[PDB]
């Protein structure tokens, strides 16, 4: 089965792409990474940094997750990210997304040994 660490990579990692403005990016990526298959995932963030640099966040600042869990980690630097959010007309199975580039600290929940990102929690 897909591991928790691989699911994070499929859902949130896009290291090869730059922060260049790209208005259709989320419509393309939300489908390609299977985040529109069973429902429209309402919000999803992709990170344009290396996998090593994102895995390293699990050793950075321990902070509370949005839900109250306490195994989240905030990156010391802001990172090049893309926020994908459903549009007002989006309705499954016809999902549609707005793309927004940002530079923000990422917050991920980490698990396992080795200790790696398994959930993308927030950017601030």
């Amino acid at each position, epitope marked *: 089965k897909e591991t928790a660490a691989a699911k994070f990579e499929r859902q949130h990692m896009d290291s090869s792409t730059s922060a260049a403005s790209s208005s259709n990016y989320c419509n393309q990526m939300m489908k390609s990474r299977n985040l529109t298959k069973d429902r429209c995932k309402p919000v999803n963030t992709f990170v344009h940094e290396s996998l090593a640099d994102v895995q390293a966040v*699990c*050793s950075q*600042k*321990n*902070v*509370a997750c949005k839900n109250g*869990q*306490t*195994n989240c*980690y905030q990156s010391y630097s802001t990172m090049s990210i893309t926020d994908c959010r459903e549009t007002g007309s989006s309705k499954y199975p016809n999902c549609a997304y707005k793309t927004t580039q940002a530079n923000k600290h990422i917050i991920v*929940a*980490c*698990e*396992g*040994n080795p*200790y790696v990102p398994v959930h993308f929690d927030a950017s601030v």
Partner: nanobody
Amino acid sequence: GSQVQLVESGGGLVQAGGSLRLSCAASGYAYTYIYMGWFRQAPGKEREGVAAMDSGGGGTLYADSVKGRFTISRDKGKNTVYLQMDSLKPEDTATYYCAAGGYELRDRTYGQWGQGTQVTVSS
């Protein structure tokens, strides 16, 4: 210095009915771990959470088999956690591990681990 290290002390060999104190001080991390806790692996058994506590001294949780006998504390230094173990039983024999940076007693959520300290309770 550059590495996070969870330094464990105390533990060791003790007779049943006796007491031990385990201590763990994390060095190398400049901020505060929200949760720290103690885990153990007894001979013949999977690793289990023994006690955990958040940096405010709250969120305190204990394995049912040690409630009323073990006391966890975090009031004795930044990123330090102590486990006072009284009325020790032979089945408390195990390698005890300090852990930091996780949530409650869920061992998969903790990313920093001590190397493990033997506790042996003889009958």
